[PDB]
């Protein structure tokens, strides 16, 4: 019983972290094969808008310090891959796992391996918000911390940490170097989009609440998908369209989605001092897939 935000075990990814230092800047890189991926602002000499193509034109390969532990890697060449640098190094990472890249979509969960000085320090699960930010814990030096999912032995890399918005939201890029949410790796004012709770995830959390015996909030009443959706776009929640991933949940609890959707409206306002699985507010960080593996295996 119980539900917790979990990370997948990080062992396979910890052996791929390297420390990338250039000038007065230090951050983390991802060493796979003979390439090191890191945020391109490691080569920024500053406040004002950075011209990255110029920074790369004046690069001096020998002022790079790349190391895995106390093993230093010689830099062979450096090219721009969107918001990342692709650094070919003279050594192959022998512990490179089987891996792929995938760009995650709003509402999907993945794991952050939080890194500092080129070493993993913490691991936690996150969920991509509708404004393409994550609710992270990163301080200066954390850029380049990778985000990953592990499927059937293969590591799917989906995130390298980049920046913190002035509101505390965190932003990374995918491994192709495309910034999530289109934010710019510039030290400038840019305000994030509004953020709407991911209703399907909220449903997953309430089904898990039912599976664990939390039922005081359950509506006797109901509301059709459509009538809910017209209410969602005025109350900070996403619409629902497909209720078919909840079929197996509806069967194991006997509670259908329209009943939960009515509970959601009632619970959006307040919990009334009560709690659901320790929470006093609706949370959209749990996906149906997460709930299934925890409640059943």
């Amino acid at each position: 019983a119980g539900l917790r935000k979990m990370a997948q075990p990080s062992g396979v990814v910890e052996k791929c972290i390297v420390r990338v230092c250039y000038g007065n800047m230090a951050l983390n890189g991802l060493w796979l094969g003979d390439t090191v991926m890191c945020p391109r602002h490691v080569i920024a000499s500053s406040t004002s808008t950075i011209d990255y193509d110029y920074a790369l034109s004046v690069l001096r390969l020998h002022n790079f310090s790349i190391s895995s532990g106390n093993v230093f890697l010689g830099v062979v060449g450096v090219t721009m891959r969107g918001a990342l640098l692709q650094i070919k190094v003279n050594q192959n990472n022998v512990h490179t796992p089987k891996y792929t890249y995938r760009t995650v979509r709003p509402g999907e969960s993945f794991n952050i391996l939080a890194c500092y000085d080129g070493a993993a320090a913490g691991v936690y699960g996150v969920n991509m918000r509708s404004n393409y930010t994550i609710r992270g814990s990163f301080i200066n030096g954390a850029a380049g911390s990778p985000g990953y999912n592990i499927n059937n032995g293969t590591v799917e890399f989906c995130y390298l940490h980049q920046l913190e918005l002035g509101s505390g939201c965190h932003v990374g890029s995918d491994l192709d170097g495309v910034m999530y949410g289109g934010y710019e790796d510039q030290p400038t004012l840019q305000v994030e989009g509004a953020s709407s709770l991911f209703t399907e995830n909220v449903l997953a959390f309430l089904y898990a609440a039912l599976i664990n015996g939390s039922t005081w909030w359950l509506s006797s009443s109901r509301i059709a998908v459509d009538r809910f959706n017209e209410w969602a776009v005025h109350n900070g929640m996403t619409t629902v369209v497909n209720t078919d991933c909840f079929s197996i949940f509806a069967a194991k609890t006997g509670v259908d989605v329209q009943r939960l959707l009515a509970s959601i409206q009632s619970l959006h306002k307040n919990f009334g001092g009560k709690q659901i699985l320790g929470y006093t507010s609706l949370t959209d960080e749990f996906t149906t897939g997460e709930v299934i593996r925890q409640m059943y295996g």
């Binding site: 951050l27 954390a142 980049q162 920046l163 918005l165 002035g166 030290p187 400038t188 004012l189």
Partner: peptide
């Protein structure tokens, strides 16, 4: 206001 970490 955006901080490059």
């Amino acid at each position: 206001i955006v901080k490059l970490q």
